[PDB]
């Protein structure tokens, strides 16, 4: 009877196929131990869809842009109730003075805007001076140095430096408003 031979051949080949597939799957499962194999930080290593990976990469880029743009405003109404008398209040005033006097004033249609990445007072003032060459090169350098000395440098920063920075900012704004009526 050939039917019995066909049946037994089918049974043995089916069992062999099943055991081979399940053994390969079991080997794969055993090898992929998540407590032994070091993972990858890449999002594409866990998410197969390219659209979701791209969306999350864009969200991470937006978060990094926010981190760059997230700058503390030291000169604040309730932050001056604190400090106020402490010796470092003057540099706190100075670091925000440049921002308030320039960005808060030059936030118009034709005014320049500080870049979100690589935010530099020196580079921003250079960009402004490129459009408006009336401002001397000494003015921008001195203003940038005053703000940088307030922010980072151990040299004595006091009311005199704050007054100098305010006078230079007033001169800069006066010339820039003369050039921008």
């Amino acid at each position: 009877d050939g039917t019995s031979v066909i049946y037994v051949c089918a049974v043995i080949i089916l069992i062999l196929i099943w055991v081979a597939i399940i053994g390969q799957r079991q080997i794969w499962r055993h090898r992929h131990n998540v407590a032994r194999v070091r993972p990858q930080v890449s999002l594409s290593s866990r998410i197969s869809s390219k659209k979701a990976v791209l969306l999350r990469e864009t969200q991470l880029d937006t978060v990094m842009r926010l981190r760059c743009e997230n700058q503390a405003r030291l000169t604040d109404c309730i932050s001056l109730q604190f400090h106020g008398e402490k010796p470092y209040v003057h540099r706190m005033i100075a670091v925000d003075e440049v921002t308030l006097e320039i960005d808060g004033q030059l936030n118009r249609i034709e005014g320049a805007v500080q870049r979100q990445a690589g935010e530099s007072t020196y580079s921003y003032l250079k960009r402004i001076r490129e459009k408006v060459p009336s401002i001397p090169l000494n003015l921008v350098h001195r203003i940038a140095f005053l703000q940088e000395s307030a922010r980072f440098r151990p040299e004595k920063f006091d009311v005199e430096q704050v007054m100098e920075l305010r006078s230079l900012l007033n001169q800069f704004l006066r010339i820039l408003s003369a050039e921008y009526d």
Binding site: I6, C9, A10, L14, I17, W18, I21, R29, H32, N33, V34, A35, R36, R38, P39, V41, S42, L43, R46, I47, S48, S49, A52, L55, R56, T58, Q59, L60, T62, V63, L66, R67, E69, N70, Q71, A72, L74, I78, S79, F82, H83, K86, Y88, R91, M92, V95, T121, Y122, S123, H141, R142, A144, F145, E148, S149, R151, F152, P154, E155, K156
Partner: protein
């Protein structure tokens, strides 16, 4: 046909395999499509996908699944496979959920291969964008009680099982990701009854493995700024908290609603929210500064600062849902746990590896709300059996039986507000090892931890740290005080000289007020107290040639201590090896540190071009001396003390200064210092001193004002106390009582002012067995002043300082003493012997490490670059500052009145102000000079005649030497170049032009000056005291305390240089330890009628001084003054009738009066000397023999190989001899006196008139008291004398000769008897000790102890290893120290046999004992070379 059945079977195979192994994929596709559509996941930006699921097992509650992925924009949750069982066959116990009863686990979840990857925190960043109106960011991202109760009743216990799981924290913008992994997580989530809340959710479970680490992000663009981790475990990255098991219990109240009228309380009915973590075996728990930087980066990303001033949270009111108040964390270490701190110093991996015992817990309460004070979080760590070790060559750091930390950290509302850290440290029975390398290591660790990021005002947050360290139940600090800071790194039997400070309570407080942004100066104050039963113990290597001597001295000294021994310490309780020499009840040390913070100005993020940036910035300093120095105020007080004084105290103080505040701050193992090429020697030295890698402000100097005050010091002058006589009280160790010792050091940039002030000091000497009485010595005061002059010319910045002038001034007050003879003379002799032996320590002296042999230029003795410039070489040998500096010592002793009292004789030695000066650049000569100025010293003697109820004393003899003014010019030191004088002159005038403090170099005088005179700057521009120092004509005491109120004029004697217009000594009450509970009457009368009678007034009653109130030591000194010998005018007698290069006057005059009774009294003294000889300890004899060996440098005939050195010329003397006036007298029943007068002589060699006259007290009857007795002369004269050697009457004269010659013969016989007595005693006692040591089986008494690994580093190591007569003596020291029969020599013992009187037998006994000892000695005897000539 076969084709049809083949097609059918192929279809069977395909369909069956697909439906049994691949239908899950299509079912998962369908369910993935359905789920995100029905709940709108894709619309809400959620990526969801299922790679496999089963539908046929629903009627068994089983739902298999595979490749389940869930991403919501913040974290990715991925599961490789698993199954979800709902065991519906388990009956529901109740209609409604009863939280108070047990429920079956109807829900069972198994997850295989769980991934959780947290890469973003969109909520906080969206909140920040909303609060800052960043509209651009907000658009680019493109973004029920009944049911709860029924579901929790239906599910019962949620059994969640995770075979393997990993948690990854990080994204593409973080350099490193936090990888947390575990295995075999079995957990049971349950809901139970909760007080004040809806329900309590508990998440218990265990994990059979857990590990956390920081792994490298592959997407990151690492630059040179990024720093690699100190250590990695292969691909796992930097480890953190490895463990073998973890048991976790997470509890969280499910919040309800407020029912009371008042809002939710902050302290009452708090919702429960806790977390418990119990760790098993193999917990390693590493960390470090690099891990801290990575933690800061990851946390700052995932928890960004909004820079918003917070507000006190509004507590929910009635009817509103409650909120969580705080979270409690409890971490328990159930086994022994390691806790390591790893950091990098250059290219070497350093570590602080600690350990804690089982059941060491960490508690952590974190407030989850904000109040009007902001928010805070607590911490309570407890480490049992906490043991710490370092990575240095000396790895021992710390150990205690319990360590408790209580930290409270408060954050105010404003993000910029001042934080407050309050940390309390508590130790129980803690012992520590302190080396200066530990301070260097911890400073490097702290600097690495802080980092190199620049300070930003927009990121600056002020904060104070309140540190309070407490040690209870005993503390112990061990300091390694090996000479030249050698260390033995052997784990066992470390042969290190160690000093341990022990006590009951130790305190340490330190506030860190970092409340200013880049302040010009930062001030930090430290306090440290040892508060009860404080002691100082000293240990020496067992075979160091100091330990046996010290142990013998301690065993044999008969000292009574007022301070009970301290039971504290852990490694210093072995009294046989540890010597407890100091005992006090309080030691407080205060530190006041003012410093300019070291800002790395190269890290300032300046976008301005450097060309114009330098214009605005101030010019940088070219030299470290151009900077304003830092400040450090040190204030140490020792409240009281009971001291076992010895020279080892001085030695240990010197080693402390060298190893902790001197050039030798760095340890050196005794196994590494093997370098012979100076080129590579300099290279290794250069690498450690990386001057080019540091800014100029790193080498900023520091002004230090040290004030050390030691109060109420009772010191035991340890010696070999004599033998005990049965009928007499044992003679104890002499005791010195000092009320206060004040030490002030004022070190500035260019000079240091060392000033030591001592109050009046007593010395009570115990009454001897002879019976004369107790002795006393009184010192009115002592002051030391040292002016060190500094310069930085041609000095390496690592040293940054060379000393070219060193002026010292010793001022000794009035010395008054009343000592008995010969006991107290012997006491002084052996006190000086032990003191000098221990201070010098010739066999204990060690070679300086080659890398530590600094020069005048800050480089090494060998391979010095500046000397290389001379003779045009790369490197040459410079010379040390000791050989080149100008040193000058001024010594002044206001007075000296010592009386030696015998039964029938006293001998008073009185002196005038004595000045001694040592000047190595005296006048124009730059060689060692000694100047002696003794205006007068007299010796008087009184002989007691007791034929009356009142004592009768006569001036038997007199002496007087006046006008001694000698200038000694010692030759140049041997092995010194011929041009040392020129080199020293150039060195001195090079490092002086900037200051001109040594005025004698710039004076325009033909004859230069010295600090011998006032031609130097000494504590001021004008040296007032030094101007008239050598002017002894006025005879004016120099120790007169006073206050000088001119800041430019130098301060007077006993006037603090730290304070202003204040004496260095303050009379303040302090703690002290109380006491625990001739032979013929006719001849003597005949001499009394002629010789001047005197009254002797001894001190009234020498008692034991007690400190009591301030000034009581002064009162004891004032009561026991010097003995007075008062002359009587009515009994005045015949004592007065009379008629290399060395320069100066030997003496102005030399008086001498002698009578036969005076020589009789000298005989009395000599006889008393010999009587006390058998009562002397043989140990002092062993000590003196050993002193001979060591002072000879062990120059045996066997050790002559080591001595191959290979004044000798130009010795000239020009001195003036005194006018000698000798007056003799002799009376016998009648009075004959002979007067000798030698006029002044001079040596170039001449003489002068000599008059010898023999008078005769013959009355005015035969051709004011004795008005009838003139003097009739028999004269004899010599006109002059020049020696040039350059390289009846009988009847009256007979009684004179037969008396003077008889007395002289008796004196000479007595002297010979004393000499032979001493020799016989020496031989007999040495033989006795040798025999007793030979017949001893005690383990400690042995020829050689240990391996003597430290002996290789000692000078004269080869010599002492081949003084076999000195190794044997060291064994004898060990016999005195440890043998049980050693107290067999504390008996007053004469010769055991009458045979020992004969010389030959007593010498042969000693020779035979030496022969017996030779075989035992020779086993370890290391012979230098070989002497076969002596062997035969």
């Amino acid at each position: 046909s076969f084709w049809v059945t083949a097609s059918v079977v192929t279809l069977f195979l395909a369909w069956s395999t697909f439906v049994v192994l691949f239908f899950s994929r299509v079912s998962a596709l369908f369910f993935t499509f359905v789920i995100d559509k029905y709940l709108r996941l894709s619309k809400n930006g959620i990526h969801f996908k299922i790679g496999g699921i089963s539908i046929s097992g629903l009627h068994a509650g089983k739902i298999m699944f595979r490749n389940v992925i869930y991403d919501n924009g913040d974290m990715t949750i991925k599961v490789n496979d698993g199954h979800l069982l709902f065991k519906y066959w388990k009956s529901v116990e109740h209609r409604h959920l009863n939280l108070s009863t047990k429920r079956a686990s109807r829900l069972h979840l198994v997850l295989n291969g769980l991934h959780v990857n947290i890469y973003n925190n969109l909520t906080k960043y969206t909140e920040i964008a909303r609060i800052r109106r960043f509209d651009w960011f907000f658009e680019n991202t493109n973004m029920p009680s009944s049911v709860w109760e029924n579901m929790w009743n239906l599910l019962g216990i949620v059994h969640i099982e995770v075979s393997a799981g990993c948690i990854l924290v990080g994204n593409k913008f973080l350099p490193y990701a936090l990888w947390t992994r575990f295995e075999n997580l079995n957990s049971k989530t349950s809901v139970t009854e909760s007080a004040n809340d809806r329900a309590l959710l508990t998440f218990e479970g265990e994990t059979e493995n857990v590990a956390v680490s920081l792994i490298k992000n592959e997407q990151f663009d690492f630059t040179a700024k990024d720093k690699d981790p100190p250590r990695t475990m292969g691909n796992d990255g930097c480890p953190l908290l490895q463990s073998a098991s973890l048991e976790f219990v997470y509890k969280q109240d499910l919040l309800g609603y407020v029912t009371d009228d008042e809002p939710q309380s902050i302290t009452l009915k708090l919702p429960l929210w806790s977390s418990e973590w119990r760790f098993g075996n193999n917990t390693v728990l590493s960390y470090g500064p690099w891990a801290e930087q990575q933690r800061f980066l990851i946390y700052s990303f995932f928890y960004p600062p909004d820079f918003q001033n917070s507000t006190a949270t509004a507590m929910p009111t009635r009817g509103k849902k409650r909120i969580h108040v705080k979270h409690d964390v409890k971490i328990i270490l159930t086994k022994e746990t390691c806790m390591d701190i790893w950091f990098m110093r250059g290219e070497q991996l350093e570590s602080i590896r600690t350990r804690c015992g089982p059941l060491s817990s960490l508690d952590m309460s974190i407030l989850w709300i904000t109040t009007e004070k902001g928010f805070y979080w607590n911490m309570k760590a407890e480490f049992l059996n906490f043991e710490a070790t370092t990575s240095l060559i000396f790895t021992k750091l710390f150990s205690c039986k319990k360590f408790n930390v209580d930290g409270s950290f408060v954050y105010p509302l404003t993000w910029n507000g001042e934080q407050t850290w309050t940390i309390d440290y508590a130790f129980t029975k803690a012992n520590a090892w302190f080396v200066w390398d530990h301070k260097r290591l911890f400073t490097d660790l702290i600097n690495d931890w802080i980092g190199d990021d620049p300070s930003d005002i927009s990121k600056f947050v002020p904060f104070r740290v309140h540190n309070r360290m407490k040690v209870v139940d005993g503390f112990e600090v061990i300091m390694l005080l090996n000479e030249s800071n050698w260390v033995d790194t052997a784990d066992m039997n470390a042969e290190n000289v160690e000093v341990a400070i022990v006590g009951e309570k130790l305190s340490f407080e330190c506030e860190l007020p970092f409340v200013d942004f880049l302040p010009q100066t930062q001030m930090v104050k430290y306090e440290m107290r040892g508060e009860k039963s404080v002691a100082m113990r000293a240990k020496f290597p067992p075979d160091s040639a100091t330990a046996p001597i010290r142990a013998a001295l301690s065993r044999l000294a008969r000292c009574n201590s007022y301070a009970p021994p301290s039971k504290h310490g852990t490694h210093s309780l072995d009294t046989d090896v540890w010597f407890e020499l100091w005992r006090t009840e309080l030691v407080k040390m205060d530190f006041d540190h003012h410093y300019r913070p070291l800002i790395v100005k190269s890290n300032i993020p300046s976008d301005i071009p450097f060309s114009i940036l330098s214009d605005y910035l101030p010019p940088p300093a070219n030299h470290p001396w151009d900077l304003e120095p830092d400040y450090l105020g040190v204030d140490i007080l020792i409240e009281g003390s009971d001291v076992k004084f010895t020279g080892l105290l001085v030695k240990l103080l010197f080693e402390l200064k060298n190893n902790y505040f001197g050039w030798y701050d760095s340890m050196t193992s005794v196994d590494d210092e093997k370098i012979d090429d100076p080129i590579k020697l300099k290279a290794s030295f250069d690498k450690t001193n990386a001057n080019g890698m540091k800014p100029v402000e790193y080498f900023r100097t520091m002004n230090v004002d040290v004030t050390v005050r030691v109060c109420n010091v009772r010191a035991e002058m340890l010696l070999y106390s004599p033998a005990i006589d049965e009928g007499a009280e044992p003679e104890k160790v002499p005791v010195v009582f000092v009320e206060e010792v004040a030490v002030e050091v004022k070190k500035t940039k260019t000079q240091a002012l060392i000033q030591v002030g001592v109050s009046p000091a007593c010395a009570y000497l115990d009454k001897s067995s002879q019976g004369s009485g107790p002795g006393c010595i009184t010192l009115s005061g002592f002051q030391f002043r040292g002016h060190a002059m500094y310069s930085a010319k041609e000095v390496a910045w690592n040293m940054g300082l060379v000393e070219y002038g060193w002026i010292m001034e010793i001022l000794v007050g009035d010395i008054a003493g009343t000592l008995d003879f010969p006991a107290h003379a012997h006491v002084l002799h052996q006190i000086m012997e032990s003191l000098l032996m221990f201070v010098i320590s010739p066999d204990d002296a060690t070679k300086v490490p080659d890398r530590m042999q600094f020069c005048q230029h800050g480089q090494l003795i060998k391979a010095c670059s500046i000397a290389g410039k001379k003779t045009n070489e790369i490197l040459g040998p410079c010379k040390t500052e000791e050989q080149m500096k100008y040193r000058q010592i001024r010594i002044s002793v206001d007075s000296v009145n010592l009386t030696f009292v015998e039964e029938k004789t006293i001998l008073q030695i009185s002196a005038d102000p004595v000045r001694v000066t040592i000047c190595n650049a005296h006048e124009s000569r730059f060689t060692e000079h000694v100047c002696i100025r003794v205006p007068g010293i007299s010796i008087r003697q009184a002989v007691r005649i007791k034929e009356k109820p009142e004592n009768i004393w006569i001036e038997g003899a007199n002496a007087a030497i006046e006008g001694v003014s000698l200038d000694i010019e010692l030759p140049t030191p041997k092995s010194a170049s011929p041009t040392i004088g020129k080199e020293r002159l150039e060195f001195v005038r090079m490092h002086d032009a900037d200051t001109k403090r040594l005025h004698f170099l710039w004076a325009d005088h033909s004859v230069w000056g010295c600090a011998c005179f006032g031609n130097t700057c000494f504590f001021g521009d004008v040296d007032e005291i030094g101007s008239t120092f050598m002017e002894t004509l006025t005879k004016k005491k120099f120790f007169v305390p006073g206050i000088e109120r001119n800041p430019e004029k130098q301060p007077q004697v006993m006037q603090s240089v730290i304070l202003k217009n204040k004496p260095i000594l303050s009379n303040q009450p302090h703690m002290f330890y109380k006491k625990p509970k001739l032979q013929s009457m006719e001849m003597s009368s005949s001499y009394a009628t002629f010789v001047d009678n005197v009254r002797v007034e001894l001190p009234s009653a020498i008692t034991v001084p007690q400190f009591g109130e301030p000034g009581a030591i002064l009162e004891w000194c004032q009561a026991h003054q010097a003995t007075r010998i008062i002359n009587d005018v009515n009994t005045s007698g015949v004592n007065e009738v009379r008629f290399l290069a060395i320069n100066g006057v030997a003496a102005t005059s030399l008086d001498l009066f002698v009578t036969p009774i005076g020589i009789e009294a000298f005989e009395r003294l000599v006889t008393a000397a010999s009587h006390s000889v058998p009562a002397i300890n043989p140990c002092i004899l062993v000590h003196m023999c050993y002193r001979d060996c060591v002072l000879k440098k062990h120059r045996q005939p066997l050790t002559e190989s080591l001595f191959a050195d290979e004044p000798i010329s130009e010795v000239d003397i020009t001195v003036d001899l005194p006018r000698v006036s000798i007056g003799l007298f002799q009376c016998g029943v009648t009075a004959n006196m002979g007067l000798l007068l030698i006029d002044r002589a001079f040596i170039q060699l001449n003489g002068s008139a000599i008059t010898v006259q023999l008078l005769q007290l013959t009355n005015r009857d035969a051709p004011r008291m004795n008005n009838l007795e003139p003097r009739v002369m028999m004269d004899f004269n010599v006109s002059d004398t020049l020696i040039i050697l350059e390289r009846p009457i009988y009847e009256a004269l007979a009684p004179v000769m037969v008396s003077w010659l008889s007395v002289v013969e008796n004196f000479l016989r007595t002297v010979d008897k004393f000499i032979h007595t001493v020799e016989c005693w020496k031989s007999v006692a040495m033989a006795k000790v040798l025999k007793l040591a030979l017949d001893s089986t005690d383990e400690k008494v042995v020829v050689k102890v240990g391996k003597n690994r430290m002996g290789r580093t000692r000078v004269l190591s080869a010599h002492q290893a081949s003084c076999p007569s000195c190794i044997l003596l060291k064994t004898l020291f060990r016999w005195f120290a440890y043998a049980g029969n050693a107290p067999g020599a504390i008996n007053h013992r004469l010769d055991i046999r009458p045979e020992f009187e004969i010389e030959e037998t007593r010498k042969t006994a000693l020779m035979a004992l030496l022969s017996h000892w030779q075989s035992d000695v020779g086993k370890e005897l290391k012979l230098v070379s070989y002497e076969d000539a002596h062997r035969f």
